[PDB]
């Protein structure tokens, strides 16, 4: 009697926003990770990402700004452990050990999976094909690899990506010093996919804007495309499929760098008959990687 009023309110496509059955899980998890992210970005105590007593102060009230602020990952003492609040002894022991990071990334990864489900859900309710779901799976797999898979391979949640602008740069620099990601070819396919996606976006935009004259709607949609170029219809499948499989590749590239099968070290490729080593452009990269690797203790 009352349940059907709720099963009609949820499943209706005549709403402002479509709250599906995937939205039933998507809304409180992406609200909990959002409210804990705003709280732990503004006001959060310092967190030791190592197992020593020198903690990283990542929050806004402890002397940061928008660029340098972050939600610091969990401690090395925790590792791959599940750390909710009731597992801790106190609230201060939870906040000191990086518990907000685990809370935010678990509810975010649960809510983004139900965002993919809600996209497929509405599509099926609207009578559409399932591609949007598929294309959103490439940043979803890229976010799963950077928060879950690389901590599983390295064995600790401290090796996950921090939730800040400068923490992302620290993750990238430390990843290159450990793994040499720039010479890893699955990353190079990611750069080619992202560069080509921006290229085809600007090129496809410019070529349409210049060849579209008028388009109206009665409010039977009408469009008068100015046709005729100079000297099948799969442009949009290529437009989606270039950037997607490019981001997929670099997602499973860092998922293979999780298990330390990492990059390409052309270490002393060229030699001289006098037992002399002639450097190349790889030795300068490996010489820099030894810079950042030694500073990371």
């Amino acid at each position: 009697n009352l349940w059907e009023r709720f099963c009609n309110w949820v499943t209706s496509t005549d709403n402002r926003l479509y709250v599906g059955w995937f939205g039933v899980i998507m809304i409180p998890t992406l609200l909990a990770a959002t409210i804990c992210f705003v709280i732990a970005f503004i006001a959060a105590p310092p967190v030791d990402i190592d197992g020593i007593r020198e903690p990283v102060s990542g929050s806004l009230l402890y002397g940061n700004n928008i660029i340098t602020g972050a939600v610091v990952p969990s401690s090395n003492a925790i590792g791959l452990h599940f750390y909710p609040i009731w597992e801790a002894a106190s609230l201060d022991e939870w906040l000191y050990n990086g518990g907000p990071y685990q809370l935010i990334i678990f509810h975010f990864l649960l809510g983004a999976s139900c965002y993919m489900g809600r996209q497929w859900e509405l599509s099926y309710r609207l009578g559409m094909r399932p591609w949007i779901c598929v294309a959103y799976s490439a940043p979803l797999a890229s976010a799963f690899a950077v928060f879950l898979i690389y901590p599983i391979g390295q064995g600790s949640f401290s090796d996950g990506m921090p939730l800040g602008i400068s923490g992302t740069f620290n993750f990238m620099i430390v990843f290159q010093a450990e793994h040499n990601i720039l010479m890893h070819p699955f990353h190079q396919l990611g750069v080619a996919g992202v560069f080509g996606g921006a290229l085809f976006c600007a090129m496809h935009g410019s070529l349409v804007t210049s060849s579209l004259i008028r388009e109206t709607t009665e409010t039977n949609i009408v469009a008068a495309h100015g046709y005729f170029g100079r000297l099948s219809r799969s442009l949009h499948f290529f437009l989606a499929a270039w950037r997607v499989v490019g981001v997929w590749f670099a997602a499973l590239g860092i998922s293979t760098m999780a298990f330390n099968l990492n990059g390409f070290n052309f270490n002393h490729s060229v030699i001289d008959a006098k037992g002399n080593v002639i450097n190349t452009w790889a030795d300068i990269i490996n010489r820099a990687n030894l810079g950042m690797e030694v500073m990371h203790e």
């Binding site: 349940w3 059907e4 099963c7 009609n8 949820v10 059955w21 995937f22 039933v24 899980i25 409180p28 909710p84 609040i85 009731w86 801790a88």
Partner: peptide, 29 residues
Amino acid sequence: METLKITVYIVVTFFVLLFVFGFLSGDPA
């Protein structure tokens, strides 16, 4: 901590059971 533990457990069972129940039962009407 157990007052926040069984509270969170009640909400997670309440939402996953509602998701499973509404996905299957109640497809027409």
